[PDB]
């Protein structure tokens, strides 16, 4: 749920994957995978929830508001998600 | 690696989300064009309305510094208002994005004191307009709860109607303005309450004999009333 | 900027007003009584000028003199070309669409059916089931 | 690199555009919106017949999510609306059966 | 009516807001002055208990959360803010009738008790003195 | 009480008192200490003013509720009638039920009193309102019965009522505990800041 | 600056509007039969109204009449000091705090189930995408 | 009720002042105050020798 | 032609909206529901029963008291699937390529 | 009984929040009594 | 640009979502971290907004002075006349004196120009005004003389004038140095606060 | 006379103060909005140069 | 709401106030000899005013006349872009900052020599007292 | 504000910060005998000796 915990989750995932191998990883390493994805998802929701709520609001109001004009309402969210992924998975 | 490739079909296919976007990006897919919503209707501050106020058509004063440019309702609208949905009607009386009078408090105790003295509610100051769907969901939930509370109540739909009118008038952000619209239904509920009590507890009165000139004219019909 | 529906509005709005449009189909043309013919099944033979053009424009965008609109357009054309073959595979393989591909019906049967009687929306349950009453 | 997210947001934008064009009486714009609505998605196409036959908890999850995004009841008579509703529901069903939804605020 | 004025019923919303702001400002000033005094004394004493003891040097009740006034009640013959259901015709009152060769009350409308209006029209308003048997002008 | 404003020069000083030499290391350090002190005082002021305002507001609420003779889930009112107290404690802690000793008319009256009291107490936003009203409606349905026969019928509403009730009680307890913990943490932090200010005022330098 | 104001509007009488007052109107005076009727009722022992009795049977709660110098002028006053009740827990609400910004269940519920569902859907789609990225990264 | 107690003390002092001003010959003027003073008596258990 | 709707008429506008090319079910607009109190109420009830947060979160379920499903999705299933196949093949029905299926659906639903 | 901060007509008067004042006048009064004529004035 | 306001519930939640259990240790710690974060953000906002406002104000002042063609003790104006520049640099850096080449009328004119310029430059609050005016009055007294004879008489006033002048220059230098030091200290503090916020946001916990 | 009106000579001191407050509030809102944007971007980027 | 106002004050003529206008007053009209005088001056080559010359010798700085369609209507306009000067150092003043509160020479000088002298006198007296206390403490 | 050609005449000055709006009232009807006619006692008729009560305490 924190960035540290999610990073440790992904390290567990990668080391157990190197242990298992490229052939049986999806079979052997499902629980660690789900834990890692859930932690990364918590981090993503925490750090990008404002932009998602803003997009939700613009969608409710038909993108009629000032802040909904253009594509920033979407690009901000996509940039947050890209940054979170680049910060977590590598 | 480009960001948001599959996410702008509105751009790839020249689809405008609104006539303002159509006019801006020059897609020209709206046959009737676009009459822009002016800035005084797109944003602004709360104002006083009544003629029996001295600071009428003046911005509401707050403890914090706030832009004093007011939202101006549509007083001389065009004849053809092609979109008569709630989305386009609400813009004639409120701004969809809410008012521009919100604070950013440097401290928590200023917020506390404003609330304690009755000068701030985030419900009122940090909020947008409600969509028709949201209004309908709220109204239907309230109606369900009231029907569960008592089906055999005559003031049921009157209470439901005042709730509906408050929601439609956006009482979260203009409570005084909405109460001005809804007190009629509150009064009707107040009447229905007594009308129900007097039926439950049999309450009646001795009516006097008929007046000599109950009828204005002998040839006139005296329609009988309970 | 508005293009008025009724330039002679106090005269034109009353007689000969505009109606509500109809967007399901043109309604000014005859009705086809046969479905569309099955188009020739696609493959990756045909993504030539999409793949190479996307490569071109991405290489030029990496320099920066290309832009992003062009990259999006090229990539989306390429992805459309791939989605053609993916959809063809899905349709031909997955059995649930085997009935749908060979779908045939006529307006007479459409007018003689009686399912429109059952098109009424249901009713939401009672709010007391939340408290289990 | 984010196809699910991108297509979701595009679908939502196109739904908003359809609603706006309907309110403003714009058949050209709303037909453009209908045509541009990601009908070429193999995942959603495969999940459509799965959604049409699902039942129970998964169906209730997808119904909850669809009523969140689009609570207004579409007209039973307008097939374009019906079809766009079906497409969005199939998309949500695919996303849920890939990674299930967690709709409660209480969670750990 | 005097009771209503104590509760601010005859006030306008501007006056209510100004009274609210006045209370807010007085309270804020009291608090900050008390804070300055408390901090000075606790600094010269070097003791936190002193600051704590200044927390109860000033509490009757609270300010009201909402207020209602007379100008929020709607009024109007044509104002739909007063119309819930139509009132039947046999229960509505009649306007007075006057008709003769010399004078009438149909060439104009004087209005209600609140929403009044000029009976004469714009072209003869400048010559109102000519439509009167007596005229008592203003004092200026 | 406040101090008077400070004195000001009568003759105008424009820049004559400005420094003709750049600052030194100790002067810079003293400036940093001054900045630390003002930040500390700002934090202390925020804590103190929030605490004062909340204390005053909540004491005013308590006095208002005592004036209008209110009673909550914590039954802490001495001016209550014993009958009203029994009724409220039945609604909060026990089971509202009509006794077989009573005549059916008096049972109707008791249930009407329960309904009036509970509807005045709980508004439509309250979650327990619907279960309570349902339970009292079942009592109205089953007035002309014994408690043994009434239990079977009113159980379905009493279960939801008791559940919502205990939920509210747990909410109150948790709220009290969390507020106490937060208050104590804030006060400890403020005390530490005060001592830090004290040592920085012992270290401060200048005149 | 409100008392003792100047004449702001004109006073006038329109031509041939009627007055309805004769020449003896100043010598005319009003009259009500109510005092004589009261005397006669008191002298003849006729049925009295219930306003002569201070107790009030017209409600279940006790009311007592307060008289203004005469039995004809009264108001009922309730005697009970009514107890009020609240089926509410204390300390569960902080309305001054904006809760849409704080992270937690209370914050999501001051927000909506719709926003929370949207967030969960975005979460699921993001997890799908990141799972794909993990797959392609670890297959290499 | 301390507010009411102090109010009644003020009222009693006012009554004594009025009575002294009028004198013991003209005492039927101050029949005003018995209305409230008897209520004071019944409330506080006090007597005022009225 | 489209005249202004005053603020007093908005409550009637919400449940009897004007005609559009894409109308809703006015008869079902009073049946659209989405409870924001569903999960809070569930949690309150479960915690009163005596469970922990983890048990409550495991027992939590989404609200069934939501807007009802369109019956067209169950009655016109095959027609809708065929229309979606046509759209997926013919690029969303550009230049009238799914008019066959759409007209069959429209006739079936409308009946003159 | 549902929207207290938005329905001011059904709310108590500011004299009720003040916690300070034979028979006494009532302590709690609403603004909804303004919709009645003979609430405070007598029926004489 | 701003974001839209956040979404709000359509149905009223009163307290149903309130916690029914007291907080835990990790939750309390996270709350403390949140308070630290908001304090850090407050400090950062103060720094950033002060820096922005001062930058904007001083750039506006610079643009106004360039627009109205001003020149100060630091002669940094290119649109000046060479004669005006020589006169100002004499008044600021060198010695104002009338040349023997000139006729007495032209010497009077030069001294009048000096007096006009200096009186427009220095106001009565300025400390160097009195020495400058005294020196120019001595020049007026000694117009009909040579520089060699004038030096002996005007030196006593030119000394005070030069002293006040160099004092102003030293003030300017010290002001520049101190402002630079303060700015750099503030920026370093802001950067450190930013990194502290970064690590606390890496440590923050919740959703 | 129109020149004097551009400079606010016929205005009253209340109107001058109100214009001043209006400018102050507009500037404050611009500044705080820009601060929010800057802080958001610098938080997602984790870089002080962005704030700068 | 300022334009098209109503008649607010009455219009009247007091009794026997004079008017000073005859019956041919409407046929009366004005006349100025200025145009004829200008023509005659131009024709006879009489002394012209200096306003016919755009250059202005009436000051030391260069001025040029701007004419509004006629030599009779002109305004002088200065040509120089005047250079301004400040015998002031930069950055020596921060007026927004209150300087009476900061400790230092600048603070005392934003305060006064009177306050500083008073402080020094108090300092001396305090030093005397503390010297006495030191003496009595250390004699013990 | 003081002038009669101002709409907010005899009204307190508005500031960005919250300030008590109760105004200083000059002595408009002074007594005939004003035994102390020094500046100390005269200035109180037009200004307050302690300054106005409109000062701010800035949070930043």
DSSP letter for each residue of A22-71: TTTHHHH-HHHHHHHHHHHHHHHHHHHHHHHHHHHHHHHTTT-SSTTSSS
CA distances from K85 to K79, K88, K198, M13, M85 (A): 10, 5, 53, 70, 11
The residues that bridge with G85 in the sheet, in sequence order, are F71
Name every chain K residue with its beta carbon within 8 A of the beta carbon of I43.
Answer: 17, 20
Task: Please state whether beta strands M63-70 and M73-78 pair in parallel, antiparallel, or not at all (unpaired).
Answer: antiparallel
Cβ count within 10 A of residue B140:
21
Q: Are B16 and D29 in contact (CB under 8 A)?
A: yes
Contacts of C30 (CB under 8 A, 6+ apart): none
Alpha helices per DSSP H over N8-52: 39-43
Q: Are J14 and E19 in contact (CB under 8 A)?
A: no
CA–CA gap between residue E50 and residue B117 (Å, rounded): 28
CA–CA gap between residue G107 and residue G95 (Å, rounded): 12
CA distances from D43 to C86, D40, I79, I82 (A): 9, 9, 20, 17
Phi (first) and psi of residue B119, to 5 degrees: -125, 10
Burial of F130 (0-12, 13-18, 19+ CB in 10 A): buried
Min Cα–Cα distance to chain N from F57, Å: 20
CA–CA gap between residue K64 and residue F77 (Å, rounded): 71
Half-sphere exposure of F185 (CA within 13 A, CB side): 15
The token pair that represents L18 in the structure block: 């109100």
Question: What subunits make at least 3 CB pairs under 8 angstroms with B?
Answer: A, C, D, E, F, G, I, J, K, L, N
The answer, for G10 touching chain E at a CB cutoff of 8 Å, is yes
Cβ count within 10 A of residue E77:
9
- Dihedral angle over CA of B172, B177, B181, B185, nearest 10: 50
In 3D space, the residue among G69, G130, J19 whose CA is nearest the CA of residue D3 turns out to be G130
Nearest CA in chain I to B80: I2
**Do B181 and I4 count as a contact with CB atoms less than 8 A apart?**
no
Name every chain F residue with its beta carbon within 8 A of the beta carbon of M88.
Answer: 15
**Do D46 and C21 count as a contact with CB atoms less than 8 A apart?**
no
B218: part of which helix (H) or strand (E)? none
Min Cα–Cα distance to chain E from J17, Å: 6
**Do L31 and K194 count as a contact with CB atoms less than 8 A apart?**
no
Name every chain I residue with its beta carbon within 8 A of the beta carbon of D86.
Answer: 73, 80, 84
Handedness of CA F29, F33, F34, F39 (dihedral sign): positive
J35: helix, coil or strand? helix
CA–CA gap between residue A59 and residue A77 (Å, rounded): 14
Handedness of CA K93, K97, K99, K100 (dihedral sign): negative
CA distances from B223 to B187, B220, F70, F103 (A): 29, 9, 53, 47
CA–CA gap between residue D22 and residue D81 (Å, rounded): 11
Min Cα–Cα distance to chain N from L32, Å: 14
The token pair that represents G84 in the structure block: 């009020």
Min Cα–Cα distance to chain F from M132, Å: 24
In 3D space, the residue among A44, A55, K9, K28 whose CA is nearest the CA of residue G108 turns out to be K9
Identify the DSSP state of B83. -
Q: Which residues of B touch E (CB under 8 A)?
A: 48, 50, 52-55, 58, 60-61, 63, 113-114, 116-119, 175-176, 179-181, 183-185, 188, 223
Annotate F131-197 with DSSP letters as a single string: HHHHHHHHHHHTSSS-HHHHHHHHHHHHHHHHHHHHHHHHHHHHHHHHHHHHHHHHHHHHHHHHHHH
CA distances from B202 to B197, G63, M4 (A): 8, 21, 63
In 3D space, the residue among D2, D75, D84, D70 whose CA is nearest the CA of residue D35 turns out to be D84
Contacts of E50 (CB under 8 A, 6+ apart): E38, E41, E42
CA–CA gap between residue G75 and residue M137 (Å, rounded): 82
Identify the DSSP state of M50. G
The token pair that represents C20 in the structure block: 């509500």
The token pair that represents A43 in the structure block: 């981090």
CA distances from B181 to B149, B163, E12 (A): 25, 11, 18
CA–CA gap between residue M119 and residue A54 (Å, rounded): 60
User: Biggest alpha carbon distance in chain J?
Assistant: 37
Task: Please state whether beta strands G84-85 and K70-71 pair in parallel, antiparallel, or not at all (unpaired).
Answer: unpaired
The residues that bridge with D24 in the sheet, in sequence order, are none
Cα end-to-end span (Å), chain I: 27
CA–CA gap between residue A64 and residue A77 (Å, rounded): 18
The answer, for B11 touching chain A at a CB cutoff of 8 Å, is yes
Q: Are E33 and B68 in contact (CB under 8 A)?
A: no
The answer, for M10 touching chain E at a CB cutoff of 8 Å, is yes
Tokens 């939920």 belong to residue: F167
Q: What is the resolution of this structure in A?
A: 4.8
The token pair that represents K9 in the structure block: 């519930």
Contacts of E84 (CB under 8 A, 6+ apart): B184, B185, B188
Cα end-to-end span (Å), chain D: 29
CA–CA gap between residue B176 and residue B181 (Å, rounded): 9
Min Cα–Cα distance to chain J from E107, Å: 36
Annotate K170-193 with DSSP letters as a single string: HHHHHHHHHHHHHHHHHHHHHHHH
L50: helix, coil or strand? helix
The answer, for I8 touching chain E at a CB cutoff of 8 Å, is yes
Handedness of CA F143, F149, F154, F158 (dihedral sign): positive
**Do I22 and D86 count as a contact with CB atoms less than 8 A apart?**
no
CA–CA gap between residue D57 and residue D43 (Å, rounded): 21
Residue of E76, E78, E80 to mutate for I, most I C-beta atoms under 10 A? E80
The token pair that represents D101 in the structure block: 């939804």
The answer, for B119 touching chain K at a CB cutoff of 8 Å, is no
Annotate E33-88 with DSSP letters as a single string: HHHHHHHHHHHHHT-HHHHHHGGG----S---S----STTS---SS-TTS-SSPPP
The residues that bridge with G76 in the sheet, in sequence order, are G65
Min Cα–Cα distance to chain L from K59, Å: 16
CA–CA gap between residue D67 and residue B140 (Å, rounded): 15
Half-sphere exposure of B216 (CA within 13 A, CB side): 1
Please tell me which of the candidates I70, I90, I108 has its beta carbon nearest to residue C36.
I90
Q: Are K19 and G93 in contact (CB under 8 A)?
A: no
Q: Are D32 and B14 in contact (CB under 8 A)?
A: yes
Identify the DSSP state of D74. B
CA–CA gap between residue M85 and residue M93 (Å, rounded): 18
K52: helix, coil or strand? helix
Annotate F41-87 with DSSP letters as a single string: HHHHHHHHHHHHHHHHHHHHHHHHHHHTTEE-SS---SSS-HHHHHH
Burial of I64 (0-12, 13-18, 19+ CB in 10 A): middle
B222-225 contacts, C-beta under 8 A, 24 or more apart: B223/E90
G74: helix, coil or strand? strand
CA–CA gap between residue F64 and residue F61 (Å, rounded): 5
The answer, for F74 touching chain C at a CB cutoff of 8 Å, is no
Cβ count within 10 A of residue F176:
16
The token pair that represents A72 in the structure block: 């920033």
Contacts of H50 (CB under 8 A, 6+ apart): H34, H37, H38, H41
Annotate M88-132 with DSSP letters as a single string: --TT---TTS--SSS-SHHHHHHS-HHHHHHHHHHHHHHHHHHHH
Q: Are K79 and K91 in contact (CB under 8 A)?
A: no
Cβ count within 10 A of residue B125:
21
Q: Are E131 and G15 in contact (CB under 8 A)?
A: yes
Helix, strand and coil content of chain D, in percent to the nearest 5, comes to 70, 0, 30
Identify the DSSP state of I69. P
Annotate C7-75 with DSSP letters as a single string: TTHHHHTTSS-------SS-SSSPPPSS-PPPPPP--GGG-HHHHHHHHHHHHHHHHTSS-SHHHHHHH
Three-point CA angle J27, J28, J32, nearest 5°: 145
Name every chain B residue with its beta carbon within 8 A of the beta carbon of K4.
Answer: 97, 128
The token pair that represents I91 in the structure block: 């690029």
Q: Are C104 and C35 in contact (CB under 8 A)?
A: yes
CA–CA gap between residue K96 and residue K150 (Å, rounded): 12
CA–CA gap between residue M69 and residue C78 (Å, rounded): 72
CA–CA gap between residue N37 and residue N6 (Å, rounded): 32
Cβ count within 10 A of residue B219:
6
The token pair that represents I89 in the structure block: 């093949």
In 3D space, the residue among B131, K52, F45, G47 whose CA is nearest the CA of residue E43 turns out to be F45
Contacts of F164 (CB under 8 A, 6+ apart): C131, F127, F128, F131, I44, I45, I48
Nearest CA in chain B to I38: B141
Cβ count within 10 A of residue B44:
21
Identify the DSSP state of K5. P
CA–CA gap between residue L32 and residue K147 (Å, rounded): 63
Contacts of G103 (CB under 8 A, 6+ apart): A46, A49, K206, K207
C114: part of which helix (H) or strand (E)? none
CA–CA gap between residue K59 and residue B177 (Å, rounded): 46
- Dihedral angle over CA of F69, F71, F76, F80, nearest 10: 60
Cβ count within 10 A of residue C89:
13
CA–CA gap between residue B162 and residue C3 (Å, rounded): 40
Reported residue count of chain E is: 140
In 3D space, the residue among B71, B43, B73 whose CA is nearest the CA of residue B59 turns out to be B71
CA–CA gap between residue K191 and residue C75 (Å, rounded): 41
**Do B132 and I8 count as a contact with CB atoms less than 8 A apart?**
no
């Amino acid at each position: 749920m924190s960035v540290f915990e999610a990073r440790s989750s992904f390290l567990d995932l990668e080391q157990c994957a190197r242990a298992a191998g490229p052939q049986r990883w999806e079979a052997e390493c499902q629980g660690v995978r789900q834990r890692a994805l859930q932690a990364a998802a918590d981090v993503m929701s925490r750090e990008c929830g404002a932009y998602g709520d803003s997009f939700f609001q613009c969608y409710r109001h038909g993108f009629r508001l000032e802040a909904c004009q253009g594509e920033k309402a979407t690009m901000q969210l996509l940039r947050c998600q890209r940054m979170v992924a680049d910060r977590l998975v590598p | 690696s480009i960001l948001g490739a599959e996410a702008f079909p509105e751009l790839l296919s020249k689809v405008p989300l609104n006539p303002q976007m159509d006019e801006d990006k020059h897609f020209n897919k709206y046959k009737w064009g676009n009459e822009p919503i002016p800035v005084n209707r797109r944003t602004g501050s709360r104002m006083n309305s009544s003629i029996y106020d001295n600071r009428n058509h003046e911005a509401v004063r707050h403890p914090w510094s706030t832009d004093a440019r007011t939202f101006h309702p549509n007083d001389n609208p065009e004849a053809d208002r092609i979109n008569t949905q709630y989305s386009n009607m609400v813009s004639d009386s409120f701004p969809e994005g809410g008012f521009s009078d919100a604070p950013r408090f440097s401290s928590n105790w200023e917020r506390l004191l404003a609330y304690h003295h009755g000068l701030y509610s985030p419900e009122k100051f940090n909020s947008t307009t409600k969509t028709a769907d949201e209004i309908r969901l709220a109204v239907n939930d309230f109606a369900a709860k009231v029907h569960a509370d008592d089906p055999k109540n005559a003031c049921k739909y009157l209470m439901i109607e005042e709730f509906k009118c408050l929601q439609s008038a956006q009482a979260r952000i203009d409570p005084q303005g909405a109460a001005t619209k809804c007190v009629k239904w509150f009064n009707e509920w107040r009447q229905c309450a007594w009308d129900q009590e007097k039926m439950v507890k049999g309450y009646n009165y001795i009516e006097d004999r008929r007046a000599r000139k109950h009828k204005p004219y002998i040839g006139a019909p005296d329609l009988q009333y309970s | 900027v508005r293009n008025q529906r009724y330039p002679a509005s106090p005269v034109q709005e009353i007689f000969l007003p505009e109606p509500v449009p109809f967007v399901q189909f043109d309604q000014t043309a005859p009705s086809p009584n046969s479905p569309p013919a099955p188009l020739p099944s696609p493959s990756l033979s045909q993504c030539e000028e999409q793949k190479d053009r996307y490569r071109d424009i991405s290489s030029m965008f990496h320099r920066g003199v290309a832009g992003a609109e062009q990259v999006r357009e090229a990539y989306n054309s390429m992805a459309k070309c791939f989605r053609r073959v993916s959809v063809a595979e899905v349709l031909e393989s997955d059995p649930a669409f085997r009935q749908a591909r060979n779908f045939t019906m006529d307006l007479k049967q459409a007018e003689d059916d009686q399912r429109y009687k059952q098109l009424q929306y249901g009713r939401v349950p009672s709010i007391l089931t939340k408290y289990h009453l | 690199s984010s196809p699910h997210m991108d297509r979701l947001l595009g679908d939502l934008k196109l739904l908003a555009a359809y609603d706006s064009a309907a309110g403003w009486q714009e058949p050209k714009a709303m037909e453009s919106a209908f045509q541009s609505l990601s009908w070429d998605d193999a995942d959603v196409l495969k999940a459509l017949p799965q959604y049409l036959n699902c039942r129970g908890e998964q169906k209730r999850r997808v119904d909850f999510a669809y009523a969140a995004l689009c609570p207004r009841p579409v007209d039973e008579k307008d097939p374009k609306q019906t079809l766009m509703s079906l497409w969005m529901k199939a998309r949500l069903f695919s996303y849920d059966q890939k990674h299930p939804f967690v709709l409660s605020p209480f969670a750990a | 009516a005097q009771l209503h004025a104590s509760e601010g019923f005859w006030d306008s919303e501007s006056e209510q807001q100004e009274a609210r702001l006045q209370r807010h400002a007085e309270h804020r000033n009291d608090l900050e002055t008390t804070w300055e005094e408390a901090l000075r004394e606790a600094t010269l004493a070097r003791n936190f208990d002193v600051l704590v003891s200044y927390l109860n040097h000033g509490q009757n009740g609270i300010p009201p959360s909402v207020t209602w006034n007379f100008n929020a009640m709607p009024y109007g013959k044509e104002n739909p803010d007063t119309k819930t259901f139509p009132i039947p015709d046999h229960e509505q009152p009649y306007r007075a009738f006057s008709l003769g060769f010399t004078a009438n009350n149909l060439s104009g409308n004087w209005g209600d008790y609140i929403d009044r209006q000029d009976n004469k029209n714009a072209l003869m308003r400048p010559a109102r003195m000519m439509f009167t048997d007596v005229f008592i002008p203003t004092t200026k | 009480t406040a101090l008077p404003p400070p004195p000001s020069a009568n003759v105008a000083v424009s820049f004559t008192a400005a420094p003709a030499e750049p600052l030194s290391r100790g002067e810079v350090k003293a400036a940093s200490l001054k900045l630390e002190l003002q930040n500390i005082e700002r934090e202390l002021k925020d804590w103190w003013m929030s605490r004062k305002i909340l204390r005053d507001r909540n004491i005013g609420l308590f006095n208002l509720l005592q004036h209008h003779n209110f009673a909550g889930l914590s039954v802490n009112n001495a001016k209550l009638s014993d009958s009203q107290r029994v009724m409220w404690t039945d609604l909060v802690q026990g089971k509202p039920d009509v006794e077989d000793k009573l005549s059916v008319d008096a049972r109707e009256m008791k249930v009407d009193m329960y309904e009036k009291l509970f509807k005045q107490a709980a508004d439509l936003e309250n979650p327990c309102r619907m279960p309570g009203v349902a339970y009292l409606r079942c009592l109205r349905d089953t007035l002309t019965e014994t408690q043994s026969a009434r239990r079977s019928s009113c159980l379905n509403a009493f279960s939801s009522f008791d559940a919502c009730r205990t939920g509210l009680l747990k909410q109150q307890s948790a709220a009290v505990e969390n507020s106490l913990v937060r208050q104590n943490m804030a006060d400890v932090r403020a005390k530490a800041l005060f001592e830090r200010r004290a040592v920085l005022l012992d270290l401060v330098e200048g005149k | 600056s409100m008392d003792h104001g100047m004449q702001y509007s004109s006073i006038y009488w329109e031509t041939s509007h009627r007055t309805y007052l004769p020449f003896w109107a100043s010598l005319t005076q009003k009259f009500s039969w109510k005092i004589m009727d009261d005397q006669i009722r008191s002298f003849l022992r006729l049925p009295k109204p219930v306003t002569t009795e201070p107790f009030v049977f017209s409600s279940g709660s006790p009311y007592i009449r307060r008289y203004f110098g005469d039995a004809d002028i009264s108001v009922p006053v309730p005697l009970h000091a009514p107890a009020h009740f609240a089926f509410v827990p204390t300390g569960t609400v902080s309305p001054w705090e904006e809760t849409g910004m704080e992270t937690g269940p209370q914050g999501a519920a001051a927000r909506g189930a719709a926003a929370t569902a949207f967030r969960a859907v975005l979460e699921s789609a993001w997890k799908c995408d990141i799972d794909e990225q993990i797959k392609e990264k670890l297959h290499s | 009720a301390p507010h009411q107690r102090a109010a009644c003390e003020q009222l009693h002092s006012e009554y004594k002042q009025c009575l002294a001003k009028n004198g013991r010959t003209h005492f039927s003027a101050c029949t005003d105050f018995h209305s409230k003073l008897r209520a004071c008596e019944n409330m506080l258990g006090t007597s005022y020798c009225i | 032609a489209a005249s202004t709707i005053p603020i007093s008429q908005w409550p009637s506008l919400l449940y009897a909206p004007p005609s559009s090319p894409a109308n809703p079910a006015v008869e079902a607009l009073p049946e659209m529901q989405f409870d924001d109190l569903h999960y809070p109420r569930q949690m309150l009830l479960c915690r009163g029963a005596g469970y922990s947060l983890e048990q409550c979160n495991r027992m939590a379920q989404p609200d069934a008291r939501v807007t009802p499903e369109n019956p067209a999705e169950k009655l016109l299933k095959e027609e809708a699937v065929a229309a979606i196949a046509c759209l997926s093949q013919r690029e969303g029905g550009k230049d009238e390529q799914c008019r066959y299926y759409i007209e069959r659906m429209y006739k079936l639903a409308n009946k003159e | 009984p549902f929207m207290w901060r938005q329905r001011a007509y059904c709310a108590p008067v500011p004299s009720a929040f003040a916690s300070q004042q034979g028979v006494r006048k009532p302590l709690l009064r609403s603004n909804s009594e303004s919709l009645s004529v003979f609430s405070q004035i007598p029926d004489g």
